[PDB]
Every structure is written in structure tokens, then in C-alpha cells.
Amino acid sequence: RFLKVKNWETDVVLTDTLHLKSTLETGCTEHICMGSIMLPVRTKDQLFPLAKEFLDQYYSSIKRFGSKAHMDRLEEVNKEIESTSTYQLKDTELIYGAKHAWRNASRCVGRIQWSKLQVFDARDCTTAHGMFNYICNHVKYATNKGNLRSAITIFPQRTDGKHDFRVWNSQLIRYAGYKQPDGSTLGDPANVQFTEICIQQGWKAPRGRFDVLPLLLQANGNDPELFQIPPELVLEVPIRHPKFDWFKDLGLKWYGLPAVSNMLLEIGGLEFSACPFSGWYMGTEIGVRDYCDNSRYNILEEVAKKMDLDMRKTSSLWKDQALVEINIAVLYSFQSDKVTIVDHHSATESFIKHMENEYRCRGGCPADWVWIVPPMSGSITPVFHQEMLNYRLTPSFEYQPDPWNTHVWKG
Amino acid sequence: RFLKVKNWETDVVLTDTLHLKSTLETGCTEHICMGSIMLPVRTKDQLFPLAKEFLDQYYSSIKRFGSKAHMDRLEEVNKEIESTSTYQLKDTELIYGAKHAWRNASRCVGRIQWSKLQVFDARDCTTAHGMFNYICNHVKYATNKGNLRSAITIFPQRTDGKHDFRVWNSQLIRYAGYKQPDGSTLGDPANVQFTEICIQQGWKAPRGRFDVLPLLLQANGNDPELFQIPPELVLEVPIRHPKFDWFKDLGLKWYGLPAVSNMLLEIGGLEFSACPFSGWYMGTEIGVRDYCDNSRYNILEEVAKKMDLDMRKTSSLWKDQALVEINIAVLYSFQSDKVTIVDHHSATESFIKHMENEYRCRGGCPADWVWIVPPMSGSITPVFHQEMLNYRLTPSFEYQPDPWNTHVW
Numbered sequence: 001r002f003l004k005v006k007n008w009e010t011d012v013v014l015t016d017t018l019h020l021k022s023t024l025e026t027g028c029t030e031h032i033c034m035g036s037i038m039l040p041v042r043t044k045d046q047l048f049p050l051a052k053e054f055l056d057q058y059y060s061s062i063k064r065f066g067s068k069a070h071m072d073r074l075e076e077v078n079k080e081i082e083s084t085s086t087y088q089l090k091d092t093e094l095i096y097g098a099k100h101a102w103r104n105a106s107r108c109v110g111r112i113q114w115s116k117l118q119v120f121d122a123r124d125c126t127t128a129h130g131m132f133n134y135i136c137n138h139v140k141y142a143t144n145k146g147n148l149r150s151a152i153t154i155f156p157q158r159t160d161g162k163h164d165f166r167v168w169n170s171q172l173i174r175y176a177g178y179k180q181p182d183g184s185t186l187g188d189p190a191n192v193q194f195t196e197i198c199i200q201q202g203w204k205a206p207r208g209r210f211d212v213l214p215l216l217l218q219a220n221g222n223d224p225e226l227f228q229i230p231p232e233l234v235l236e237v238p239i240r241h242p243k244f245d246w247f248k249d250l251g252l253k254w255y256g257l258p259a260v261s262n263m264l265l266e267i268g269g270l271e272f273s274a275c276p277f278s279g280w281y282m283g284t285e286i287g288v289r290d291y292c293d294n295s296r297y298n299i300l301e302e303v304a305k306k307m308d309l310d311m312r313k314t315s316s317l318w319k320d321q322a323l324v325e326i327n328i329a330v331l332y333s334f335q336s337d338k339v340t341i342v343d344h345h346s347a348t349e350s351f352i353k354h355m356e357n358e359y360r361c362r363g364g365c366p367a368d369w370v371w372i373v374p375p376m377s378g379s380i381t382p383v384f385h386q387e388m389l390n391y392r393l394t395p396s397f398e399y400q401p402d403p404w405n406t407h408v409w410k411g
Numbered sequence: 412r413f414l415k416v417k418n419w420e421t422d423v424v425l426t427d428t429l430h431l432k433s434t435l436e437t438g439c440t441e442h443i444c445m446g447s448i449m450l451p452v453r454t455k456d457q458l459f460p461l462a463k464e465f466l467d468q469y470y471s472s473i474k475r476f477g478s479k480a481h482m483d484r485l486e487e488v489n490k491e492i493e494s495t496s497t498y499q500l501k502d503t504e505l506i507y508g509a510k511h512a513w514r515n516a517s518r519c520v521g522r523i524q525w526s527k528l529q530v531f532d533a534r535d536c537t538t539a540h541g542m543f544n545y546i547c548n549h550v551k552y553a554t555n556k557g558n559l560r561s562a563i564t565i566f567p568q569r570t571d572g573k574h575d576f577r578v579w580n581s582q583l584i585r586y587a588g589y590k591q592p593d594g595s596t597l598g599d600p601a602n603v604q605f606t607e608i609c610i611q612q613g614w615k616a617p618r619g620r621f622d623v624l625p626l627l628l629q630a631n632g633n634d635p636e637l638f639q640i641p642p643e644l645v646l647e648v649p650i651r652h653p654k655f656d657w658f659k660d661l662g663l664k665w666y667g668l669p670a671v672s673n674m675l676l677e678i679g680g681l682e683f684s685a686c687p688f689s690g691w692y693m694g695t696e697i698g699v700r701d702y703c704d705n706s707r708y709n710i711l712e713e714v715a716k717k718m719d720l721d722m723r724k725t726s727s728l729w730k731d732q733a734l735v736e737i738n739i740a741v742l743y744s745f746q747s748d749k750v751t752i753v754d755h756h757s758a759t760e761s762f763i764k765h766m767e768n769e770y771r772c773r774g775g776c777p778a779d780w781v782w783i784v785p786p787m788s789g790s791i792t793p794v795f796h797q798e799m800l801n802y803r804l805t806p807s808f809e810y811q812p813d814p815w816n817t818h819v820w
């Protein structure tokens with residue numbers, strides 16, 4: 001079976017055959033679409049078919065399918081599974097797996113860059129202190145004095161689910177959030193629950209609006225431990241506006257390195273529960289969502305006030321006007337400080353080129369429209385008019401439950 | 412299988428049971444989601460269960476499920492179908508069916524108004540001249556001197572596919588589009604082929620930027636006919652900006668009445684191929700899409716120029732800045748001229764409330780996130796953070812082929 005997608009701005013029609021290689025499920029059925037739903041101990045029984053499928057893909061990509069090297073590897077992995085109940089990936093396989101997990105990430109608009117991923121092998125790690133060291137080196141490498149470089153650090157795979165490696169932070173660098181007695185929130189409302197866990201684990205909180213959170217790191221199923229990232233490793237950018245001199249007086253800043261640390265990397269049935277990865281920001285992530293979401297810093301009001309906008313009726317679009325200015329400031333600040341950032345126009349344009357390239361050389365590109373279209377100015381970016389097919393390929397990044405909900409405490 | 416939807420800005424959770432009523436299909440499977448795809452002659456057999464399903468929901472809605480009246484009507488339609496190979500809706504059923512087709516339109520953000528629909532029964536129409544008359548009356552009623560009122564006009568149902576009633580226009584009111592020898596396009600580019608069909612069918616084009624297109628009306632399957640809508644029925648709004656005086660110099664205006672005329676209304680298995688319906692605009696439909704789409708009026712660059720913005724790099728967000736000002740102007744203009752319009756903030760907020768209402772009194776609300784979220788400022792509107800379930804309920808509005816691709820001329 002063949003499937004078609006149309007760009008309605010350009011009438012370009014592309015043909016998807018890659019969706020045939022899809023195994024996992026979407027959540028949708030013939031009678032319902034769950035396209036906008038945010039989120040819709042493995043045995044040797046089901047593991048070798050997963051391993052075989054991966055190795056078949058791996059050896060196809062290196063043009064050695066059916067070779068002796070391929071057949072021996074399959075033999076080797078098989079024996080290791082019946083004997084040890086799991087198996088170990090070779091370095092080459094790990095690197096391939098991590099890159100393709102990104103390549104397959106249907107919600108990621110930045111995938112033109114997928115083949116340029118620095119992979120750090122941390123599978124020899126054994127303790128939280130070792131985790132801290134590996135993560136510090138990731139941050140230094142990735143940050144590169146403002147010239148950001150994509151990277152991922154991969155900690156040991158799950159075994160019996162009782163000895164998981166986890167990074168308890170949702171991102172390596174994030175600001176604290178504090179609920180005040182009067183109901184107000186200081187800092188980042190998104191991080192209030194995590195901030196509280198940290199504080200309980202012994203963190204002494206500065207209680208400011210932009211405090212970098214400590215790392216809470218769990219090795220081999222043990223209780224997590226607290227570590228402070230050296231401040232010299234945490235690159236930050238003061239937010240100012242190119243025409244509005246009062247904007248700096250809002251006292252806003254943000255960190256340069258987006259590094260998500262709570263997802264799970266699946267490769268050939270193996271599960272890597274600690275695998276922090278990082279790239280660079282698209283401006284709207286900070287300027288639209290981080291700053292202007294009602295449930296975050298929510299600075300629309302103060303910015304609209306200082307612009308002296310008609311905030312009485314919404315049909316004055318004061319909200320819309322402030323939003324643009326805030327996003328102008330974020331991009332201006334990052335560029336002025338020579339910290340890698342990309343605007344949503346550039347990024348979406350790149351994605352369309354990526355996607356077309358992928359349809360031609362790969363037979364498709366799974367893509368989640370709901371997530372790919374930017375949170376402002378949707379239809380003046382070229383992905384808005386682009387039809388997309390969403391399906392799940394492996395290797396993949398998956399969601400996993402927050403560890404504090406599942407962890408068995410040692411004491 | 413009793414599904415939940417969460418709002419991530421408020422933690423409000425709603426439970427959907429209405430989806431289990433759904434009949435038709437979405438285009439998705441467990442292995443693929445087609446949620447962003449734009450577009451994914453009935454026998455005696457298929458007709459009677461369809462009629463039964465409809466009459467069942469109708470008599471439940473008036474709390475007379477399992478009544479003599481119910482069973483009698485059921486038997487009456489049953490006999491008429493066996494006999495005539497089709498059937499006719501009672502007036503009350505027709506009004507119910509039309510209101511619920513709107514109610515079920517998962518892509519429509521304006522559905523909080525769904526039960527205040529004025530239904531004009533035009534099933535006695537026989538000619539294009541008659542169609543023109545019914546359509547002029549619709550337009551005048553809907554427009555109401557700027558105080559817009561929702562309305563639908565329903566022409567005779569399909570019979571054998573050879574006697575279809577069709578409005579060939581996509582909307583009752585739309586501006587012409589002409590391609591220049593120079594290369595570009597004057598007027599509305601989306602309407603370039605239709606503007607040509609009209610001329611190709613006999614229209615005399617003034618070749619302006621805002622020429623109201625003629626109606627092309629097809630009755631009983633005959634060749635369609637051109638009719639000019641009386642200009643005093645076409646309410647238009649001159650577009651000016653509340654702070655930029657040079658804005659008027661652009662020479663922009665739009666029409667007040669959005670009236671879509673190329674869809675198909677399905678009730679109880681019956682197919683109404685001509686059923687123009689109208690409401691009032693959400694501001695972004697004109698200012699974001701109509702004015703700023705690249706394959707439309709595409710005036711973004713011209714506007715930014717006049718604002719002296721830095722158009723050298725995309726990261727100046729000059730497009731975004733212009734986009735907002737244009738949309739401020741559209742709203743300002745309509746509001747100034749007392750022509751009904753709604754901004755995307757109030758409309759999306761209205762929709763969340765409608766959702767709340769539907770989950771409470773009905774058990775759910777089919778909704779297509781990809782279309783409900785406005786084309787600008789998405790995440791600062793409350794629908795962005797609202798999970799939605801999309802499924803197809805009947806009665807419904809459906810797409811149908813363009814007539815010129817079908818009509819045996």
C-alpha cells in the first residue's frame with residue numbers, strides 16, 4: 001500500500017511507503033483520532049525478535065545485509081539472550097540506534113540535524129557520582145561556549161527494572177519553582193513539584209526567581225543523590241529588547257542549553273532509562289511557552305502594561321502584540337551573546353526540506369502536525385499547510401513515569 | 412473504552428462516552444494517524460438503518476423514544492422507503508437534522524451557537540432562478556444590516572445523482588481572481604479557476620481587486636446559470652487601522668458574510684447537495700489566512716514595508732509583527748462598522764465552555780484540534796492546551812467533488 005500527503009501552499013505531493021515498516025500503535029482507530037492526546041520487566045520471550053529487527057536494519061544501513069558479519073552477530077546476540085536473558089549493543093550499534101531514535105522522533109521539528117549527533121557512551125557508569133561526572137562533561141561539550149553541539153549521554157540499560165538508572169530532573173538545566181503561602185509562585189511554576197523533592201532531599205534553596213536546580217541522580221536502582229552543576233558550566237542569557245530599554249528591567253534571563261533528561265531510549269528491545277540529550281533552542285520554546293503560558297512565568301501582563309496596551313478588551317490583541325515583542329527579545333538576546341538559537345520561520349523551513357529529502361531517500365518521514373507547527377504564527381510558517389503522517393518507528397524515544405511515583409525507597 | 416481528555420492549563424478532565432455512538436470512520440488506524448490530512452447513490456438497503464438511526468435519536472431528543480408516535484413514524488418511513496426508494500423528512504426533523512449537523516462539525520470552533528440556527532426549507536425549489544431568489548433572501552436575512560444571524564437554506568435532496576441541485580461557488584460571496592500577463596495575480600488567487608469558469612460560462616469581469624463573483628446555480632442537474640447578487644445585499648467593511656493612518660491607503664475591504672456553499676448535508680441517509688450555510692467571521696479567517704497566506708492576498712511584505720520593519724532576516728519577526736497589526740485592523744474595522752465579528756481569544760474561550768457544556772449534557776464533543784486551534788497565537792488561546800477527541804457523528808456536513816469535474820455538461 002502507498003500513501004500520499006499534499007502541501008496545500010505548493011501542491012507538492014509526496015508518497016509514503018515507510019509507514020509499512022511501522023510496528024508500534026498510535027492510539028487512533030478507524031473510529032477515533034487521538035492525535036491531540038499528550039500521552040496515548042521485559043522478557044527473553046519477546047526480546048530476540050526485537051533484536052533481530054534492529055540488527056536487520058543496522059546491517060541494511062551499512063550495506064551488509066545477509067553478510068557473514070550480520071549472520072554471526074545475530075547468532076551471537078541470540079546466544080547471549082538465552083544465556084544471560086539480555087544482550088549488549090556494540091558501540092557502532094549504539095550510535096546508530098541513538099541517531100535513528102532522533103530521526104524517528106515524529107514530534108521534533110529539528111530533525112534535519114539528526115545524523116550530526118555526538119553520542120557519549122556511559123554504559124560503564126555505576127554510581128550517582130559517576131553520573132554527575134558524565135553529565136558535567138555533556139554540558140561542557142554541548143555548550144561549547146555558546147556554539148551549541150547536539151549530544152546524548154547513554155547510561156546503563158534496564159535489567160530487571162529494580163536497578164534503573166534515572167535522571168530525576170526533566171531537563172539537565174531548569175529553574176526552581178516555589179509555591180508561596182499566599183498562593184503565588186516564585187520562579188518556574190512548571191518545576192514546583194520537583195523543586196520540593198529537591199528541597200526535601202536536602203537542597204538548600206536560594207529562593208530566587210531564576211535558581212538553577214540541582215541534579216538529582218539515581219544509579220542502579222539506589223536512592224537518588226543531589227549534585228550542584230558548576231555555575232561556570234551553566235551558560236545563561238540576560239533577556240533584553242532591541243528597541244525597548246525597559247525590557248531588561250523585567251530581570252529575565254534564560255539558560256542556553258535545552259537538555260531533556262526524563263525520556264527513555266529504546267533500541268532493539270533494550271531500554272535506556274537514563275539518556276539525557278540536548279540540542280539548541282527554537283526561540284518560541286522560551287518566548288511563547290516558557291514565558292507566556294498561563295501556567296508558567298506568564299509575563300504577558302507586565303509586558304503589555306509597560307507597552308501601555310489597551311488591555312481592557314481582548315479584541316485589541318494586546319496579548320498577541322506582547323507575545324511577538326517577547327519573542328523578538330529572546331532571539332535578539334541569544335544572537336547578541338552569540339548563543340545558538342533558531343527562529344520558528346527558519347526551523348520550519350528547514351523541516352520541510354528535511355521531510356521532502358526523507359520521503360525521497362527513506363520513503364517517508366513520520367511527523368506529528370500538532371507538535372511540529374509552532375505555538376505562534378502557525379499559518380505563516382510552511383509546516384501549517386503541510387499534510388503529515390504520524391506513525392511509530394523504532395529505535396525510539398518514549399515517555400516514562402516520573403521516578404518518584406515508582407521508586408522503592410531504601411533509606 | 413470510556414475515554415478521558417485533559418486540559419493541561421487547568422487540569423480539567425472530561426470523560427467522553429459520546430464517541431461510542433460514532434458510525435463513520437476517521438481515516439486513521441492503530442498504525443497511522445491521519446489527523447492532519449485535509450480530505451480523507453444509496454440503495455434501498457443502506458437507507459432504512461440510516462433513517463432508523465436518525466429517527467431514534469430524534470425521538471429520544473424530544474423524550475418520546477419508544478412511543479406510539481415514534482413507532483408510527485418509524486413504520487411510516489419504513490413503508491415509504493420500500494415504496495418510493497427514498498423518503499421525505501418532516502419539517503421538525505429537517506430543522507433538528509440541520510442543527511445537529513452543525514453541532515457535530517468537529518472542525519468548527521463556533522459551535523456554541525449551534526441551536527440558534529435559522530433553517531430555510533427550500534425543498535420546493537425547481538429552477539436556478541428560484542435558487543437565486545432563496546439565496547438572496549438568505550443573504551439579506553443572515554446579514555441583517557450587520558447584526559449577523561446564522562442560517563442555512565436547504566434545496567431538494569439528491570435522487571439519482573443526475574438531478575442534483577448545486578451551488579458551484581465555494582462561498583456565496585467571494586472576490587474574483589485574475590492571473591496577469593505580467594505573471595502575478597490580481598484579486599483573490601484561490602478563486603482563479605472559478606473566476607475563469609464564470610467568464611468561460613459568460614461572466615463579464617470588471618477585473619478589479621475586489622469584484623464580487625456572480626452566483627453559478629445548478630437546478631435539477633441542468634447546466635448552471637449566472638446571477639449577480641444585488642450589491643445592496645453584499646455588506647462590506649473598509650479595512651483601516653486604529654493607529655496607522657496609512658493603512659487605509661492599502662485599499663483593502665472584506666465582506667461581512669461567510670457563507671459556505673459547496674458542502675453536502677447528510678440527514679438520515681438523505682443527501683442535500685445544495686445547502687449554503689452562514690454564520691459570522693472569526694477575525695483570523697480574513698486577516699491571517701485570506702490576507703497573509705502565500706497563495707492568497709499575500710500582503711504581508713507590503714504591510715511590513717509601510718511599518719519600516721527590518722525585513723532582511725526572519726529572526727526580526729517582521730512577518731509576525733505585521734500579522735498582528737493586520738488582524739487588529741480587521742477586528743477594529745468590523746467593530747467600528749457594527750458588523751458582527753469575533754476575535755480568536757473570545758471564540759476559543761467560548762469553545763472551551765461549549766465543550767464543557769457538551770460533555771455535561773451530551774457525554775462529549777467531537778473536535779479536531781488541527782482545525783480548532785487558530786492560525787496565529789495558538790498557545791496563548793485556551794484550546795491549544797485542550798486535548799480533543801475527533802470522531803464522526805451523523806447528521807453531518809461532508810465534502811463533495813467540485814461540480815465541473817462531474818457535471819455532464
Ligand code: HEM
Pocket residue numbers: 102105107108109110111113117150151152277278279280281282285342347371397
Ligand atoms: C538541534 C536542535 C533541535 C531543535 C531546534 C529541536 C526542536 C524541538 C521542538 C521545538 C520540540 C517540541 C518540544 C516542545 O514544544 O516542548 C522538539 C521535540 C522533540 N525533540 Fe527535538 N530539537 C532539536 C534537537 C533534538 C535532539 C538532539 C534530540 C535527541 C537526540 C531531540 C529529540 C526530541 C524528541 C524525542 C522530541 C519529542 C518529545 C515528545 O515526544 O514529547 N531533539 N524538538
Ligand code: HEM
Pocket residue numbers: 513516517518519520521522524528561562563688689690691692693696753758782808
Ligand atoms: C456563527 C459563527 C461561526 C464561527 C465564528 C465559525 C467558525 C469557524 C472557523 C474559524 C472554521 C475554520 C474554517 C477555516 O479555517 O477555513 C469553521 C469551520 C466549519 N464551520 Fe463554523 N463557524 C460559525 C458558524 C457555522 C455554521 C452556522 C455552520 C453550519 C450550520 C458551520 C459549519 C462549519 C463546518 C462544517 C466547518 C468545517 C468543515 C470541514 O472541513 O469539516 N459553522 N468554523
Ligand SMILES: Cc1cc(N)nc2cc(-c3ccc(CN)cc3)ccc12
Pocket residue numbers: 258259260277278279280281282285
Ligand atoms: C533536544 C531538544 C531541543 C529543543 N530545542 N527542544 C526540545 C524539547 C523537548 C521536549 C520538551 C518538553 C516536552 C513536554 N513539554 C517534550 C519534549 C525535548 C528535546 C528538545
Ligand SMILES: Cc1cc(N)nc2cc(-c3ccc(CN)cc3)ccc12
Pocket residue numbers: 669670671688689690691692693696
Ligand atoms: C459558517 C462559517 C462561518 C465561518 N466564520 N467560517 C466558516 C468556514 C467554513 C469552512 C471553510 C473552508 C473549509 C475547507 N478549507 C471548511 C470549512 C465553513 C463555514 C464557516
Ligand SMILES: C[C@H](O)[C@H](O)[C@H]1CNc2nc(N)[nH]c(=O)c2N1
Pocket residue numbers: 008384385386387388447448449781782783784
Ligand atoms: C495540511 C493542514 O491540515 C491544512 O493546512 C489545514 C491545517 N489546519 C487548518 N485549520 C483551519 N482552521 N483551517 C484550515 O484551512 C486548515 N488547514
Ligand SMILES: C[C@H](O)[C@H](O)[C@H]1CNc2nc(N)[nH]c(=O)c2N1
Pocket residue numbers: 035036037038370371372373419795796797798799
Ligand atoms: C493538548 C495538546 O496536544 C498539547 O497542548 C500540545 C499541543 N501541541 C504542542 N506542541 C508542542 N510543540 N509542544 C507542546 O507542548 C504541545 N502541547
Ligand SMILES: [Zn+2]
Pocket residue numbers: 028032033034035439443444445446
Ligand atoms: Zn489519528
